[PDB]
Each structure stands twice: as C-alpha cells, then as structure tokens.
Point group: C2
Chain length 136, copies 2
Amino acid sequence: MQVPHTESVSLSAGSTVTIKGRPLVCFFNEPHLQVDFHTEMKEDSDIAFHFQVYFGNRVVMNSREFKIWKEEVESKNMPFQDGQEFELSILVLEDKYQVMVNGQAYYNFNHRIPVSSVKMVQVWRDISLTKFNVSN
Amino acid sequence: MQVPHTESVSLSAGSTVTIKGRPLVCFFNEPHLQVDFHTEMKEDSDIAFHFQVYFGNRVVMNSREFKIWKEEVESKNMPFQDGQEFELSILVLEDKYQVMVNGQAYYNFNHRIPVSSVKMVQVWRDISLTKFNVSN
C-alpha cells in the first residue's frame, strides 16, 4: 500500500474509516502519523478533520477552512505502543468523529464542516500501511 | 533509494554530505525533512546534529546527548522551493556544520559533540531520495 495514501471517499453518520499500519521508526525518534479528511481530491483542499499523532508524545487535531487552520485541539492520550502495528478506527457519528485505537475510543472531534462535504482521505508521514477500508 | 535512509559514515573537517531529494507533498500541507548525524548505527543512539526542515515554514536544529535533547536552535531561512528537487550539502568545518541549499550556506550549527564521534546518518520524513553521497 502506497504512502502517502490518497483515496476518494463518501462518509455519513455510521461510516467507519479503518487504517492499519506500523510506524517506520522507534518511538524514541518521534515518528508521526497524519490523517486528513479533505473536502476535494485536490491535496491543498480544505480539511474537515486533521488528525496528527506524535507517537510517544501527543495528538493534535484541527480543521483547515477556506485555506486557514482553525482552533487546535490537543490530547495527551497515547495508547499507541512502540514498535507495534496499530489499528485506527475513525467512526463518523452524528456530532463528531471518534477515533478508536485497537477498539477503544481515545480521541473525539466535533464536526466543524458537515461530513457530507468530505470527498477524500489522505494518510501520510512516518508509517507503513496495510489496510485502508471505508465501511460500505 | 529507500527512505528512511540509514548509512554508516566517517566524517572529518572537509567532509561533505550531499543529499538530493524531493518533498512528497505540496508545501501547503507542510511536509518535513529530517537529517540526523548519529554516534552509533543504533537508531536510538545520540545525535550530534539534528536538522529538521518544516518545508515552507522554518528549520529546527539540535543535538541529543546521553538520550536528552539539548538547546533548540531555530531558523526562518527558507530557500526551499515548493514542488522542487533540492540539493542539500552539509559541510563539516572545523567549528561547525554548514548546510548549503543549492550551493549557498543557509544554516550553521556549531559542534557540540566531536565530529569524530559520528558513525551514522539517517535521512527521513516526507521526501523521496535520489542521492546520498559522503565525500571521499
């Protein structure tokens, strides 16, 4: 699976985006993971949900609206395990995105852009990927 | 050329480390480049010279000594060009590392660890690579 990974999507409440991968280096060297829910296939399009993991450290979430980054949200939840494969499940709920790591919710991000505006997801930074699945 | 890229090296005053590559995404999405001069082949070994480019934004330099990050140095010099191949030349001088971008020096980092302690270089984050050359 190619990284950066870019796919067309359509999401509504009840959708799940499942991502399985592994960091490329040890946590001590702070690899990153970025998942961006875009409003168009164009890479510089707006981002309804930006999810950036600083492995071993913290998580940052934000949106990019009309080309401007908005209010940053930080979390110190760090369920990811050094050297391990992870399974991320991003659940689209009516009110928010909910990010599960290995089956339990650790991060939440209330919708700032309607989820019906999302048309693309990009997964990138310092990971290998083996699965990218949007629920049917 | 594989990224992350890890090579054994030996450096002294007069050595040059040349790196040619291209960012994987547009500058608007802030790709990164990291070059680390390590004291051992082990990935978690100390780092005599850490050079991190936030393309389109800023540069951070530091060292990691006895597993601890030391004093961060920042630069707002940004000669890198969106979408373009770059050639980085890291010159080992008696007093410092000097980083040239496309033939002109834009960043400098005085030695904190003797350069004779460097045994490995790792190049990684959001780039493709076509050249990694240590001068003979």
